Amino acid sequence: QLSSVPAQKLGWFIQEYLKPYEECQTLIDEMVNTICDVLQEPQFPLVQGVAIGGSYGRKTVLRGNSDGTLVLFFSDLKQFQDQKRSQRDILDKTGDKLKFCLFTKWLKNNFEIQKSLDGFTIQVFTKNQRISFEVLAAFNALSLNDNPSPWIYRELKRSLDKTNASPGEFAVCFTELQQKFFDNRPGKLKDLILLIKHWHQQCQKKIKPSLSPYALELLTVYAWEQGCRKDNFDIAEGVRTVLELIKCQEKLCIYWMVNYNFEDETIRNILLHQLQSARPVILDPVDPTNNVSGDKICWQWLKKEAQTWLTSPNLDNELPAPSWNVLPAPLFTTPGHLLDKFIKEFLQPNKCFLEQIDSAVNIIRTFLKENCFRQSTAKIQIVRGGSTAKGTALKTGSDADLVVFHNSLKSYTSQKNERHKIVKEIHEQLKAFWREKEEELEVSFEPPKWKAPRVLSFSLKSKVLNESVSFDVLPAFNALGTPSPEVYAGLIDLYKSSDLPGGEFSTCFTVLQRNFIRSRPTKLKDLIRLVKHWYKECERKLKPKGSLPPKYALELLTIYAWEQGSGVPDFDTAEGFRTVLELVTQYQQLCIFWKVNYNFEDETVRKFLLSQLQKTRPVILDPAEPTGDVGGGDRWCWHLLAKEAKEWLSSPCFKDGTGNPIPPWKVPTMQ
Amino acid sequence: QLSSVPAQKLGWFIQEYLKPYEECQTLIDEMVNTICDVLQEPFPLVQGVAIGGSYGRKTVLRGNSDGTLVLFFSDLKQFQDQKRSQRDILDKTGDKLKFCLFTKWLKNNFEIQKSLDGFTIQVFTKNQRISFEVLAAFNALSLNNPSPWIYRELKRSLDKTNASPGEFAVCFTELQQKFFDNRPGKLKDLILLIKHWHQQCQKKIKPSLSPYALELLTVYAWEQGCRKDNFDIAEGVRTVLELIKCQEKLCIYWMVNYNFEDETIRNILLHQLQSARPVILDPVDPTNNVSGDKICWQWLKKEAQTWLTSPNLDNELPAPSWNVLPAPLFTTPGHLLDKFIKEFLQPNKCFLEQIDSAVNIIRTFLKENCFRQSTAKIQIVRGGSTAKGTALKTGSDADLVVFHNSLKSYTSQKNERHKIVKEIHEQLKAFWREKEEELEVSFEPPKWKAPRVLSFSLKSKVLNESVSFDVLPAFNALGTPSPEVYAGLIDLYKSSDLPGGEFSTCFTVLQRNFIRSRPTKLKDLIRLVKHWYKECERKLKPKGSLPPKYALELLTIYAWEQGSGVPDFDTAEGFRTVLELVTQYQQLCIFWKVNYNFEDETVRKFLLSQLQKTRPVILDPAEPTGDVGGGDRWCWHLLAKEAKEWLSSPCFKDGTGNPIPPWKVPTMQ
Ligand SMILES: [Zn+2]
């Protein structure tokens, strides 16, 4: 069945065959609630409570016969070592003997309590849906507090070392957290998990090792959380993303920080021991010791089945196959001598695609420059800037500026009507271009989407890859017309009168920014890619907690780190990155500027430049523009990046193959 | 009519008499839309229109009502283009055209009317009549969003022409719409009621004041009071009338469109803030002080007194009203700080005596009734901001720390703590059943949820003041303490880097005894600094996690102990020194050897590791693990920027106008 269904209508296939009937759900969940109530009446004096685990506990049940557990927290279980007191199977057998005699209300028709080793099991069934609850007894480890505070995991590690160590055997104690991690998530994410489990069951059915579905449930949750936080995604992107992750099984290493952190040294040493292991490494959200991935041999079969389904003609039907961008292994886990491989494999965009968008953008520039003004004698001049014009774009979220210079604009400010006219006519000419030239480009073109107050934007997409670049169109005063100080006196006469944030006129000087980072060694552009990725990973979790300083400040720290540390075309990337995290740690003393375009030679430039150098302790003046002050002194949450850098200095990335630490370069902090 | 309506059912009275009919509104607004469309068809000089007045703000009363609409003629290009009268010629041509230009039904409901300095147009429908003043303006906003350069160009033009403060304010009418459109419906109903009352006062008395001043005052009353989009309208009325009665103090302003950042604007605001009060700066033009003739506020005071004291208000003895200050601390001169603290920040002494008498009854009843079966009784210790003498008039809090023998360690005791708090909840319910009339203060029944802290509040019978207590089971660590107790805490933290102080409540007695018994002058400075912090938190909390309030109480004590250990001092120098220390947040390292000391083998070993922490570090004098001034953890950077802004304040200028210097306090100790 499954492989014959096209990628479109998979949501229908899931609704038609996999998802449980709402009728059976609304009977069984009342059955289970009644069971949970009856086991908690004082009848059963020994229970503190119950918690529900397995596929039922996670709310991921399939239409068929299905997995579940429920855990009884007996009050004589008070320590982790009580998990080893196996004689509680006697207690479970008494619980069975009692429970089977209750059969309360109508439910006597639908229970079937059954004898089993190491305690009983209760099945619950209905016309279609059937649940097979494994019954277990455990210490409620969570009752040591009301949250997974670090002392709980410290007591866990101590208990593991005191008894005979058996990693993950006590994970059952945390079943309450396992519910909390899987509720309040989108319905489509559940439907995707059901589809992935159904495929796994088909693979288990035809192949004749074993792997628990919880590993692929975690993998699917990680795929969604990293790739597409939207609650209305396309399931056919989800499947392709998960199968791409499974194909990477020898790299795969996924973990969550939702219940535990690298803060406590006792947990940090556990995570650093586990994260540095045989990939596929799958740490569960609730127990730092419980590596969920099964026998390595089973992932070989899952690879072969992933290849087989992913290459089928029912997938792979789009010209580029759409999928989310997720890394099999976060940067933190990669050893220091593998950084140069990591950058080349995951961060660099494809060279042929950049050549294609360069060829396309010169066509865009040529078509616009001739057509936008025909009545007026003054033509627009379009200059290309941003992260694709210099060679430092990432494979994801690339950007570009098309700065548009024109004679309508007489000053940096007070010209909104002229800029609106320039944008409107560029929008009209881009529409005419899309009408006339659609098949002459070797890249796909999104039609411009625009509204009167917003910036123009359009995107160029590969025809054979997922990569894309987004351009935005920015009218600017042609200040430049290295520049002589009579141009900078124009900016200075705006700011000299008051304290203000800098740099809103940055786009006027885009050529000096591009020419500052371009022509530098490719090794340094790759280090700039690495630092921009590290910053992107910081923003992913610190943005809820503050406004981080702008990325260009760390691009400038990366260049200052190279120029001061070692001005050589080839170097160890791990020492460069370690030095950048050193400079970010030293944020308390940041005095950086470059006398490339502006110097103390002029009477007003010197007067202004000697002022900004005393504005605030952190100061990183844009080499294109003295008012730029992009390392803003007192406004931005530098502290958060300094705390995160101080955390990252523990990373595997900064340990050599011998295991000894990698030192920073000796860079001055004031310059 | 109005004065006979009780405070309850004012919402009914507003719905019954004041609010316009929706059946009428749904014609007039389409009439105005059609007029605005016709005026924007090239009428080739009209770049656009914006609607001002009571219609523009969406505050129209049922009857005849005020409005304007502004025409942005394309030849108007600088502020001084307001001054050339020829706009009346252009208006008279626009009149001549627009009187002939009519469409569909609308000829039955327009009435264009000749007027001096340009025409006017009326629009009327069943039970309604809008009158529009028609004006010409340079659309100053077209320059940028109200960016600093716009107000710099404004001030330059104002000085270049024959200066006329507020005369260019018509240019900003689009911002005046943007400030009023989004706000909650009941705030509109309150504004309608306040305007109807003002019209009744204008009717019987026989100066004048424009309603925009009282509309701004009502918006400020709501924005400073309850931010809630649902409220009792009679609290709104009572707090607005209380603000009007304070007319000689009143000074209200907004930072929504302009800031003290740009020196050209800062000098305007500092000039305006120090003016005849009631000072009412409008949200959109820093020069447009909206308050009318000073004489009119005398009449408004007398009418506020008359209505507020009526038997239809003032019916509930603890008459509820939102606590809003007539004048923000920033506006008060330095030599008036000692008066400001005493007038607005100190709670009433008799109320504190009453809650002290009541809480000793609570403690006695709980201590005897809770464990009757067990031999071990609970011990209840009172702590927090009311036990030391540093509570504010608003948002006071206190801890009832409960010590018991069930608790054998700082951690892993949740069931015992749940039992203790559950039975305290039961005994507080029994107390409320038995003793409700023996207290001289009102008691809220405890409101509780199984995982949450238990809490209850004591309220005055005769004032709005209140105190909130919460009940906190704690390990009886103390049982000055000898180091064998601190070795217990140290053996938890020594093994790892962690945030500190989660066990702070165990040492509450050492915290209270540190701030208590200090001079009352220093407790009033602590009140002032806690108010400054509360005002910083009011606007910076959306932007980051501010450092905890207890850190600034310790900076205030360190500032006094180092600056001048004398029972009386200038409060303005103390506050200036606290803002100095907050500016030098990079260097704190502030601690006190009052309880712990280096005279031990483990405490010294831990404390020399605590001293070797982030440069900004403040150690709770009660507890070496307290470390209440965290480093990167907190958003100190923001308070150090706000302090640098506050150093311009009138509070730090003497009566001669010279600046007040800080005390010479060391930053490392
Ligand atoms: Zn912050």
CSV table of C-alpha atoms in Angstrom, one decimal, chain A residues 54-403:
chain,number,residue,atom,x,y,z
A,54,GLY,CA,4.4,4.5,26.0
A,55,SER,CA,2.6,5.3,22.8
A,56,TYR,CA,-0.7,5.9,24.7
A,57,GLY,CA,1.1,8.2,27.2
A,58,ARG,CA,2.6,10.2,24.3
A,59,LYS,CA,-0.7,10.4,22.4
A,60,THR,CA,0.8,8.7,19.3
A,61,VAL,CA,-1.5,5.7,19.0
A,62,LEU,CA,-2.2,4.1,15.6
A,63,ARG,CA,-5.5,2.6,14.4
A,64,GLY,CA,-4.3,-1.0,15.2
A,65,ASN,CA,-3.2,-2.9,18.2
A,66,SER,CA,-1.0,-0.5,20.1
A,67,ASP,CA,1.6,-0.1,22.8
A,68,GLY,CA,1.1,1.5,26.2
A,69,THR,CA,2.3,1.4,29.8
A,70,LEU,CA,1.2,2.8,33.2
A,71,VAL,CA,3.5,3.2,36.2
A,72,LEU,CA,2.5,2.7,39.8
A,73,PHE,CA,4.3,4.9,42.4
A,74,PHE,CA,4.3,2.6,45.4
A,75,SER,CA,5.0,4.6,48.6
A,76,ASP,CA,7.5,2.0,49.8
A,77,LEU,CA,9.6,3.0,46.8
A,78,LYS,CA,11.6,6.0,48.0
A,79,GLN,CA,15.1,5.9,46.4
A,80,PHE,CA,16.5,5.1,42.9
A,81,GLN,CA,18.0,1.8,44.3
A,82,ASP,CA,14.4,0.7,45.0
A,83,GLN,CA,14.2,0.0,41.2
A,84,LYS,CA,16.6,-2.9,41.9
A,85,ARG,CA,14.2,-4.3,44.6
A,86,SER,CA,12.7,-6.7,42.1
A,87,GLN,CA,10.6,-8.5,44.7
A,88,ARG,CA,8.0,-5.8,44.1
A,89,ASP,CA,6.7,-8.2,41.5
A,90,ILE,CA,4.9,-9.8,44.5
A,91,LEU,CA,3.3,-6.4,45.2
A,92,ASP,CA,2.3,-6.2,41.5
A,93,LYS,CA,0.7,-9.7,41.7
A,94,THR,CA,-1.3,-8.6,44.7
A,95,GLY,CA,-2.3,-5.5,42.8
A,96,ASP,CA,-3.4,-7.8,40.0
A,97,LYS,CA,-5.4,-10.1,42.3
A,98,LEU,CA,-7.2,-7.1,43.8
A,99,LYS,CA,-7.7,-5.1,40.6
A,100,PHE,CA,-9.2,-8.0,38.6
A,101,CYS,CA,-11.9,-8.3,41.3
A,102,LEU,CA,-13.1,-4.6,40.9
A,103,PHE,CA,-14.4,-4.7,37.3
A,104,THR,CA,-16.4,-1.6,38.1
A,105,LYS,CA,-19.4,-0.4,36.1
A,106,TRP,CA,-19.9,-1.4,32.5
A,107,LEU,CA,-16.1,-1.8,32.1
A,108,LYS,CA,-16.3,-5.5,33.1
A,109,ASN,CA,-17.1,-6.2,29.4
A,110,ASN,CA,-13.9,-4.6,28.1
A,111,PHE,CA,-11.1,-5.2,30.6
A,112,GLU,CA,-9.0,-8.4,30.3
A,113,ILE,CA,-6.4,-8.6,33.1
A,114,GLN,CA,-3.7,-11.1,32.2
A,115,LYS,CA,-1.0,-12.8,34.2
A,116,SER,CA,2.6,-12.1,33.2
A,117,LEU,CA,6.2,-12.3,34.5
A,118,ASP,CA,7.7,-9.4,36.5
A,119,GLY,CA,4.1,-8.1,37.2
A,120,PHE,CA,0.8,-8.3,35.5
A,121,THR,CA,-0.5,-6.5,32.4
A,122,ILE,CA,-4.0,-5.0,31.7
A,123,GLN,CA,-5.4,-5.0,28.2
A,124,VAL,CA,-8.2,-2.6,27.2
A,125,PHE,CA,-10.1,-3.1,24.0
A,126,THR,CA,-13.0,-2.0,21.8
A,127,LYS,CA,-14.5,-2.9,18.4
A,128,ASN,CA,-11.4,-1.5,16.6
A,129,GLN,CA,-8.9,0.1,19.0
A,130,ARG,CA,-6.9,-2.1,21.4
A,131,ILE,CA,-4.3,-1.1,24.0
A,132,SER,CA,-1.9,-3.4,25.8
A,133,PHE,CA,-0.8,-1.7,29.0
A,134,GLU,CA,2.5,-3.0,30.5
A,135,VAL,CA,2.2,-2.4,34.2
A,136,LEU,CA,5.3,-1.3,36.0
A,137,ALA,CA,6.3,0.0,39.5
A,138,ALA,CA,8.8,2.7,40.1
A,139,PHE,CA,10.1,5.4,42.5
A,140,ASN,CA,8.6,8.7,41.6
A,141,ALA,CA,11.9,10.5,41.3
A,142,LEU,CA,10.1,13.8,40.3
A,143,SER,CA,8.6,14.0,43.8
A,144,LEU,CA,12.1,15.1,45.1
A,145,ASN,CA,11.0,18.5,43.8
A,146,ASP,CA,8.3,19.9,41.5
A,147,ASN,CA,10.7,20.6,38.6
A,148,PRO,CA,13.7,18.8,37.1
A,149,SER,CA,16.2,20.8,39.2
A,150,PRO,CA,19.8,19.7,38.9
A,151,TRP,CA,19.9,18.0,42.3
A,152,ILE,CA,17.6,15.4,40.9
A,153,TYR,CA,20.0,14.4,38.2
A,154,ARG,CA,22.9,14.7,40.7
A,155,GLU,CA,21.1,12.2,42.9
A,156,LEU,CA,20.5,10.0,39.9
A,157,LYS,CA,24.2,10.0,38.9
A,158,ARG,CA,25.2,9.3,42.5
A,159,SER,CA,22.7,6.4,42.7
A,160,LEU,CA,23.9,5.0,39.3
A,161,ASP,CA,27.5,4.9,40.6
A,162,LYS,CA,26.5,3.6,44.1
A,163,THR,CA,24.5,0.6,42.7
A,164,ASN,CA,25.6,-1.5,39.7
A,165,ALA,CA,25.6,1.1,36.9
A,166,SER,CA,22.9,0.5,34.3
A,167,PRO,CA,22.4,3.6,32.2
A,168,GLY,CA,18.8,4.5,31.4
A,169,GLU,CA,17.3,1.7,33.6
A,170,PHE,CA,15.8,4.3,35.9
A,171,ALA,CA,14.4,6.4,33.1
A,172,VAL,CA,10.9,5.0,33.9
A,173,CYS,CA,11.0,7.2,37.1
A,174,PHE,CA,10.7,10.3,34.8
A,175,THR,CA,7.5,9.2,32.9
A,176,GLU,CA,5.7,12.3,34.1
A,177,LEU,CA,8.2,14.5,32.2
A,178,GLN,CA,7.8,12.3,29.1
A,179,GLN,CA,4.1,13.3,29.0
A,180,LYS,CA,4.9,16.9,29.5
A,181,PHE,CA,7.3,16.9,26.5
A,182,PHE,CA,4.8,15.4,24.1
A,183,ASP,CA,1.6,17.3,24.9
A,184,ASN,CA,0.8,20.8,23.5
A,185,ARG,CA,2.2,20.2,20.0
A,186,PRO,CA,0.6,20.6,16.6
A,187,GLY,CA,-1.8,18.0,15.2
A,188,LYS,CA,0.1,17.7,12.0
A,189,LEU,CA,3.3,16.8,13.9
A,190,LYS,CA,1.3,13.9,15.4
A,191,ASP,CA,0.1,12.9,12.0
A,192,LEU,CA,3.7,12.9,10.7
A,193,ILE,CA,4.8,10.8,13.7
A,194,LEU,CA,2.0,8.3,12.9
A,195,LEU,CA,3.1,8.1,9.3
A,196,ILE,CA,6.8,7.5,10.3
A,197,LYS,CA,5.8,4.8,12.8
A,198,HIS,CA,3.5,3.1,10.2
A,199,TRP,CA,6.5,3.0,7.8
A,200,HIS,CA,8.7,1.7,10.5
A,201,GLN,CA,6.1,-1.1,11.2
A,202,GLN,CA,6.1,-2.0,7.5
A,203,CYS,CA,9.9,-2.3,7.6
A,204,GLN,CA,9.8,-4.4,10.7
A,205,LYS,CA,7.0,-6.5,9.1
A,206,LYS,CA,8.9,-7.4,5.9
A,207,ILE,CA,12.5,-7.6,7.2
A,208,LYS,CA,13.1,-10.8,9.0
A,209,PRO,CA,17.6,-6.7,15.6
A,210,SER,CA,14.8,-4.3,16.6
A,211,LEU,CA,14.4,-0.6,17.3
A,212,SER,CA,11.9,1.1,19.7
A,213,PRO,CA,9.6,3.6,18.0
A,214,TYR,CA,10.5,6.2,20.6
A,215,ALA,CA,13.8,6.8,18.8
A,216,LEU,CA,11.9,7.8,15.6
A,217,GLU,CA,9.4,9.8,17.5
A,218,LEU,CA,12.2,11.9,19.0
A,219,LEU,CA,13.9,12.1,15.6
A,220,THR,CA,10.7,13.5,14.1
A,221,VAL,CA,10.1,16.0,16.9
A,222,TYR,CA,13.7,17.2,16.4
A,223,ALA,CA,13.2,17.4,12.7
A,224,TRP,CA,10.2,19.7,13.2
A,225,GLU,CA,11.7,21.8,16.0
A,226,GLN,CA,14.8,22.5,14.0
A,227,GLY,CA,13.4,22.7,10.5
A,228,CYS,CA,10.0,24.3,10.5
A,229,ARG,CA,8.4,25.6,13.7
A,230,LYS,CA,5.2,26.3,11.7
A,231,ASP,CA,2.0,24.6,12.8
A,232,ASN,CA,0.8,24.2,9.2
A,233,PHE,CA,3.7,22.6,7.4
A,234,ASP,CA,3.5,20.2,4.4
A,235,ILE,CA,3.8,16.6,5.5
A,236,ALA,CA,5.7,15.7,2.3
A,237,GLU,CA,8.5,18.0,3.4
A,238,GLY,CA,8.5,16.4,6.8
A,239,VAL,CA,8.8,12.8,5.5
A,240,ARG,CA,11.7,13.8,3.2
A,241,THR,CA,13.4,15.6,6.1
A,242,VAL,CA,13.2,12.6,8.4
A,243,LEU,CA,14.4,10.2,5.7
A,244,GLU,CA,17.3,12.5,5.0
A,245,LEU,CA,18.1,12.4,8.7
A,246,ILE,CA,17.9,8.6,8.8
A,247,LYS,CA,20.2,8.3,5.8
A,248,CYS,CA,22.8,10.4,7.8
A,249,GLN,CA,22.6,7.7,10.6
A,250,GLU,CA,26.4,7.6,11.0
A,251,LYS,CA,26.5,11.3,11.7
A,252,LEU,CA,23.2,11.7,13.6
A,253,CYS,CA,23.5,13.2,17.1
A,254,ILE,CA,20.4,14.9,18.5
A,255,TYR,CA,19.8,16.1,22.1
A,256,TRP,CA,17.6,18.6,23.9
A,257,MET,CA,18.3,21.2,26.7
A,258,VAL,CA,14.7,21.5,27.8
A,259,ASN,CA,15.1,19.8,31.2
A,260,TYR,CA,18.9,19.9,31.7
A,261,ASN,CA,21.8,22.2,31.0
A,262,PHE,CA,25.6,22.3,30.8
A,263,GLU,CA,25.6,24.6,33.8
A,264,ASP,CA,26.0,22.0,36.6
A,265,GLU,CA,29.4,20.3,36.2
A,266,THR,CA,27.9,16.9,37.3
A,267,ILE,CA,25.5,17.0,34.3
A,268,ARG,CA,28.0,18.7,32.0
A,269,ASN,CA,30.4,15.7,32.4
A,270,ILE,CA,27.6,13.3,31.7
A,271,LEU,CA,26.5,15.1,28.5
A,272,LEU,CA,30.1,15.5,27.3
A,273,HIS,CA,30.6,11.8,27.9
A,274,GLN,CA,27.4,10.9,26.0
A,275,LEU,CA,27.6,13.5,23.2
A,276,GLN,CA,31.1,12.2,22.4
A,277,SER,CA,29.9,8.7,21.5
A,278,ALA,CA,29.0,6.4,18.5
A,279,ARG,CA,26.6,8.4,16.2
A,280,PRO,CA,23.6,7.8,15.8
A,281,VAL,CA,23.5,9.3,19.3
A,282,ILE,CA,19.8,10.0,20.5
A,283,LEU,CA,19.6,11.5,24.0
A,284,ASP,CA,16.0,11.5,25.3
A,285,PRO,CA,14.6,14.8,26.7
A,286,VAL,CA,14.3,13.6,30.3
A,287,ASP,CA,17.2,11.3,31.4
A,288,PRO,CA,20.8,12.4,30.4
A,289,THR,CA,21.9,8.7,30.5
A,290,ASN,CA,19.1,7.2,28.3
A,291,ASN,CA,20.6,7.0,24.8
A,292,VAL,CA,17.5,5.8,23.0
A,293,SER,CA,19.0,4.5,19.8
A,294,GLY,CA,19.0,0.7,19.4
A,295,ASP,CA,21.5,-1.7,17.9
A,296,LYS,CA,23.7,0.0,15.3
A,297,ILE,CA,22.7,-2.8,12.8
A,298,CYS,CA,19.1,-1.7,12.7
A,299,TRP,CA,20.0,1.8,11.4
A,300,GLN,CA,21.7,0.1,8.4
A,301,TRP,CA,18.4,-1.5,7.5
A,302,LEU,CA,16.6,1.8,8.1
A,303,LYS,CA,19.1,3.6,5.8
A,304,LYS,CA,18.4,1.1,3.1
A,305,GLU,CA,14.6,1.5,3.4
A,306,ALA,CA,15.0,5.3,3.6
A,307,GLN,CA,16.9,5.2,0.3
A,308,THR,CA,14.3,2.9,-1.2
A,309,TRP,CA,11.3,5.0,-0.3
A,310,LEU,CA,13.0,8.4,-0.8
A,311,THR,CA,14.1,7.4,-4.4
A,312,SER,CA,10.7,6.0,-5.3
A,313,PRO,CA,8.7,7.7,-8.2
A,314,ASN,CA,5.9,8.6,-5.7
A,315,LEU,CA,8.3,10.9,-3.8
A,316,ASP,CA,11.0,12.7,-5.8
A,317,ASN,CA,8.3,14.0,-8.2
A,318,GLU,CA,9.1,17.7,-7.9
A,319,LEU,CA,12.0,19.1,-9.9
A,320,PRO,CA,13.8,20.3,-6.7
A,321,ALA,CA,12.6,18.1,-3.9
A,322,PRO,CA,11.4,20.4,-1.0
A,323,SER,CA,12.7,19.6,2.5
A,324,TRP,CA,13.7,21.5,5.6
A,325,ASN,CA,17.3,22.4,6.4
A,326,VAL,CA,18.4,20.5,9.5
A,327,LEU,CA,21.9,19.5,10.5
A,328,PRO,CA,22.5,15.8,11.5
A,329,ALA,CA,24.9,17.0,14.2
A,330,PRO,CA,25.1,20.4,15.9
A,331,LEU,CA,28.4,22.3,15.6
A,332,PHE,CA,29.0,21.8,19.3
A,333,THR,CA,29.4,18.0,18.8
A,334,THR,CA,32.1,18.2,16.0
A,335,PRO,CA,35.7,17.7,17.0
A,336,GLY,CA,38.1,20.6,16.4
A,337,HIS,CA,40.0,19.0,13.6
A,338,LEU,CA,36.7,18.4,11.7
A,339,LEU,CA,35.7,22.1,11.6
A,340,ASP,CA,37.2,22.6,8.2
A,341,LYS,CA,35.2,19.6,6.9
A,342,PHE,CA,32.0,20.8,8.7
A,343,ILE,CA,32.2,24.3,7.1
A,344,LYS,CA,32.8,22.9,3.6
A,345,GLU,CA,30.0,20.2,4.0
A,346,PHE,CA,27.2,22.2,5.7
A,347,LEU,CA,27.8,25.9,5.5
A,348,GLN,CA,29.2,26.8,2.1
A,349,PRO,CA,26.6,27.4,-0.7
A,350,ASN,CA,27.0,25.6,-4.0
A,351,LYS,CA,29.4,27.4,-6.3
A,352,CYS,CA,27.5,26.8,-9.5
A,353,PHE,CA,24.3,28.2,-7.9
A,354,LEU,CA,26.3,31.4,-7.0
A,355,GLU,CA,27.6,31.6,-10.6
A,356,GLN,CA,24.0,31.3,-11.8
A,357,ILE,CA,22.6,34.0,-9.5
A,358,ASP,CA,25.5,36.3,-10.5
A,359,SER,CA,24.7,35.8,-14.1
A,360,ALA,CA,21.0,36.4,-13.4
A,361,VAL,CA,21.5,39.5,-11.3
A,362,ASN,CA,23.7,41.2,-14.0
A,363,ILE,CA,20.7,40.6,-16.3
A,364,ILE,CA,18.4,42.2,-13.7
A,365,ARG,CA,20.7,45.2,-13.3
A,366,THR,CA,21.1,45.7,-17.1
A,367,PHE,CA,17.3,45.5,-17.7
A,368,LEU,CA,16.4,47.9,-14.9
A,369,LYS,CA,19.1,50.5,-15.6
A,370,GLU,CA,17.9,51.1,-19.2
A,371,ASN,CA,14.1,51.0,-18.7
A,372,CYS,CA,13.2,52.6,-15.3
A,373,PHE,CA,13.5,56.2,-16.5
A,374,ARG,CA,12.9,56.9,-20.2
A,375,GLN,CA,11.5,60.4,-20.0
A,376,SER,CA,14.0,61.7,-17.5
A,377,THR,CA,17.6,62.1,-18.6
A,378,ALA,CA,19.0,60.9,-15.2
A,379,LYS,CA,19.1,57.1,-15.1
A,380,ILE,CA,19.3,55.0,-11.9
A,381,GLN,CA,22.6,53.4,-11.0
A,382,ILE,CA,22.2,50.0,-9.3
A,383,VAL,CA,25.1,48.8,-7.0
A,384,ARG,CA,25.1,45.3,-5.6
A,385,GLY,CA,26.1,44.7,-1.9
A,386,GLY,CA,25.6,42.5,1.1
A,387,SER,CA,26.6,39.0,2.0
A,388,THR,CA,26.5,37.5,-1.5
A,389,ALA,CA,28.6,40.3,-3.2
A,390,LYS,CA,31.4,39.6,-0.7
A,391,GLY,CA,32.0,35.9,-0.5
A,392,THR,CA,30.6,35.2,2.9
A,393,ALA,CA,27.0,33.9,2.4
A,394,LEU,CA,25.7,30.8,4.2
A,395,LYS,CA,23.9,27.9,2.5
A,396,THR,CA,20.7,29.2,4.3
A,397,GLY,CA,19.3,32.6,4.7
A,398,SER,CA,21.6,34.4,2.2
A,399,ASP,CA,20.8,38.0,1.5
A,400,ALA,CA,21.7,40.8,-0.9
A,401,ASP,CA,21.2,44.6,-1.2
A,402,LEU,CA,20.5,46.3,-4.5
A,403,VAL,CA,21.3,49.9,-3.6
